[PDB]
């Protein structure tokens, strides 16, 4: 089991960490969602589907910088919504193919009432998402840590 980003940054068997740089809607009004859909940028696969089933959760999602200060967050994982920053490990998604499958994580971030102006700074860390991979074969319990960075400013109109 290993993962890679759209631009080809890899985290190999056994886990590790990588930086993910995301383009964000440049203007987001109060009452609207800023959507950060990581399923278009993070992909994983099973290296031995003939014998092994891989299990993958969002173990933890943390918010940083402007997202922590200026947004009210929800994370959608494989079709179900949970609070973000997260309060529990998600259910598992099964990985059972050698063909790359997206990691079905999307953040939905809506501005809090106090938010206004540059609510997310370009280049800033906005989230850390921990992918936890286990299997039905051995005791492997690996963390794939995704550090999410903003590519651009996000303005919340006032
Ligand atoms: C062969 O072992 C590797 O590949 C399998 C299947 O993906 C994983 O379950 C395991 O943790 C290792 O990453």
Can you give the CATH number for the domain in which 31 is found?
A: 2.60.40.1090
Q: Is the distance from CB of 152 to CB of 26 less than 8 angstroms?
A: yes
Q: List C-alpha distances in Å: 120 to 47, 53, 67, 68.
A: 37, 39, 7, 10
Query: String of b and e for 12-45 (b: at least 16 CB within 10 Å)?
Result: eeebeeeebbbebeeebeeeebbebebeebbbbb
Resolution in A: 1.7
Query: Residue 67, class by beta-carbon neighbours within 10 Å (0-12 exposed, 13-18 middle, 19+ buried)?
Result: buried
d(CA 131, CA 126): 16
CA triple 102-104-105, angle to 5 deg? 125
Q: How was this model experimentally determined? A: X-ray
The Cα 57–Cα 132 span in angstroms is 5
* Nearest protein CA to atom 8 of ligand 1, as residue: 1
At 128, which helix (H) or strand (E)?
Answer: strand 125-135
Written as six digits, the tokens of 155 are 């303005």
How many helices and strands, by DSSP H and E, does the chain display?
1, 15
Phi, psi for 15 (deg, rounded to 5): 85, -170
Contact 55, 92 (CB under 8 A): yes
> Is 125 close to ligand 1, i.e. is its CB under 6 Å away?
no
Q: Output the residue whose Cα is nearest ligand 1's atom 10.
A: 1
Total count of domains within the chain: 1
Tell me 78's DSSP state.
T
To test ligand 1's pocket by mutation, which of 10, 50, 52 has the most ligand atoms within 8 angstroms of CB? Answer: 52
CA distance 9 to 5: 5
> Which residues make beta-bridge pairs with 133?
56, 142
Range of 133's domain? 1-158
DSSP 19: E
- Dist. CA 2 → ligand 1 center (Å): 8
Query: What residues contact 79, with CB distance under 8 A and at least 6 apart?
Result: 104
Cis, peptide link before residue 135, omega less than 30° from 0: no
């Amino acid at each position: 089991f290993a993962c890679k980003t759209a631009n080809g940054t890899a985290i190999p068997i056994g886990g590790g960490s990588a930086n993910v740089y995301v383009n964000l809607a440049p203007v987001v009004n109060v009452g609207q969602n800023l959507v950060v859909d990581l399923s278009t940028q993070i992909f994983c696969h099973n290296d031995y589907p003939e014998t092994i089933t891989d299990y993958v959760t969002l173990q933890r999602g943390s918010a940083y910088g402007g997202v922590l200060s200026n947004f009210s967050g929800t994370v959608k994982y494989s079709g179900s919504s949970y609070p973000f920053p997260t309060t529990s490990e998600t259910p598992r998604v099964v990985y059972n193919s050698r063909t790359d499958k997206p990691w079905p994580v999307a953040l939905y971030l809506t501005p809090v009432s106090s938010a206004g102006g540059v609510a997310i700074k370009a280049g800033s860390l906005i989230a850390v998402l921990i992918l936890r991979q286990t299997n039905n074969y051995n005791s492997d319990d690996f963390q794939f840590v995704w550090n999410i960075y903003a590519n651009n400013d996000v303005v919340v109109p006032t």
